[PDB]
């Protein structure tokens, strides 16, 4: 499993786990920790729909569709699944503009 926030690699230890519901693909890494999700849909190519990163660097980041706010791709190889793009967040100290980082994550549902 690879995740990577604003071109830091996190090095998750966490374990992939993926379960479909209602035409979605949920896919979660780690636990409490971690707090990484994400809801695809189930189609090829898959279109993001969310992306949840946690909080990273002070900030609890995540992608939403239809908000105008960042961007997200996915591509679908197998069971691998690659989603990249832009999460926001809100600065808790300077709640003025929000906060944009990139993110590439990269894993398999797989074992």
């Given at each position: ?15 992939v786990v993926c379960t479909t519901a209602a035409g979605n693909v949920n896919i979660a ?8 999700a994400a809801v695809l849909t189930d189609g090829?190519?898959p279109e993001v729909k969310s992306?949840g ?23 679908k190889?197998?069971?691998?699944y ?27 549902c797989?074992?």
């Open positions: 499993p690879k995740v990577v926030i604003d071109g830091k690699d996190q090095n998750v230890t966490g374990s890494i780690g636990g409490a920790a971690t707090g990484i090829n190519p992306v990163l946690g909080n990273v660097n002070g900030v609890t980041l995540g992608y939403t569709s239809g908000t105008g706010q960042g961007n997200a791709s996915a591509t190889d197998g069971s691998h690659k989603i990249t793009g832009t999460a926001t967040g809100v600065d808790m100290a300077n709640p003025m503009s929000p906060v944009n980082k990139s993110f590439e994550i990269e894993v398999t797989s074992t």
